[PDB]
Design a protein around this ligand. Structure first.
Ligand SMILES: CN(c1ncccc1CNc1nc(Nc2ccc3c(c2)CCC(=O)N3)ncc1C(F)(F)F)S(C)(=O)=O
Ligand code: NA
Length: 269
């Protein structure tokens, strides 16, 4: 899993991470075609405690191998420490959705929700609780492929460090907001919010509502409204993710199967 720095061509900065800037680049793989990659850099990895924390993020991604989760390519443990990830060429999902708005076919939006449900069913199969499922952590590899982004770079995951700028209340299950309970069932609640975000073309949930007012509305039975053009079967599926009792929420394998049916019904106009 070690990569040699002379095989990396560093390109433009595509974002800022907790440990340092993230760049786009090219990895000249030995005896293979060159790959487009994302490079996580570390500014203070001279410190052993910082270096080990940064390298733990690469080990977290190394344990996963799924077509809709960004893949670890390798690490450069020489000073300055770099983590090499696969690049999702088209960038962040919210920006991509905000450009296209109604020009994206409904079949593409449902496909994105289905692809994420396969990655979340895979994480659930490994007994891994995400805790930060939101459209901001989703990347676009091509017009017909989205992926979950790096877990370390995700602002509110369990082992993620904080950025200079507390909790994503508008995405969280009631038991997570009230008692900090995070399970596979609370991940299902967040995924229903993420599906709503996709069908709303990158609009954020509960805009203009204060975080403290969200739990009162949820306890009164209020939910995010049906997005314009969203098929009623898809909205019904979202409301099942938002069952107040977590034991009544479906698991990711069921959401995957139902989304595949919804997608095939839309493709048959
Ligand atoms: C949102 N995220 C970030 N948060 C903080 C820092 C960086 C990232 C993005 N990280 C990544 N970005 C890309 N692709 C990419 C992203 C942006 C742009 C472009 C390509 C080109 C067009 C453009 O203009 N910008 N692929 C892979 C990664 C990964 F492997 F590092 F995850 S996250 C939690 O990692 O999903
Ligand atoms: Na190296």
């Amino acid at each position: 899993y070690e990569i040699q720095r002379e095989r990396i061509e560093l390109g433009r900065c595509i974002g800022e991470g907790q440990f340092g800037d993230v760049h786009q680049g090219i990895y000249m793989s030995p005896e293979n075609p060159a790959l487009a990659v994302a490079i996580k850099t570390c500014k203070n990895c001279t410190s052993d405690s910082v270096r080990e924390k940064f390298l733990q993020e690469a080990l977290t991604m190394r344990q996963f191998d799924h077509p809709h989760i960004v893949k670890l390519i390798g690490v450069i443990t020489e000073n300055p420490v770099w983590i090499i990830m696969e690049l999702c060429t088209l960038g962040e999902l919210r920006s991509f959705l905000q450009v296209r708005k109604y020009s994206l076919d409904l079949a593409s939006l449902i496909l994105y929700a289905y692809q994420l449900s396969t990655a979340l069913a895979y994480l659930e199969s490994k007994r891994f609780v995400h805790r930060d499922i939101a459209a901001r952590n989703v990347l676009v590899s091509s017009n017909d492929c989205v992926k979950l982004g790096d877990f370390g770079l995700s602002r509110y995951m369990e082992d993620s460090t904080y950025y200079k700028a507390k909790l994503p209340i508008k995405w969280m299950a009631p038991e997570s907001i009230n008692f900090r309970r995070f399970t596979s069932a609370s991940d299902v609640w967040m995924f229903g919010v993420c599906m709503w975000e996709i069908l709303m073309h990158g609009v954020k949930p509960f805009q203009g509502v204060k975080n403290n007012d969200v739990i009162g509305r949820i306890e009164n039975g209020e939910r995010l409204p049906m997005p314009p053009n969203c098929p009623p079967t898809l909205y019904s599926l979202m409301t099942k993710c938002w069952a107040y009792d977590p034991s009544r929420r479906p698991r990711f394998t069921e959401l995957k199967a139902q989304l595949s049916t919804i997608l095939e019904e839309e493709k048959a106009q």
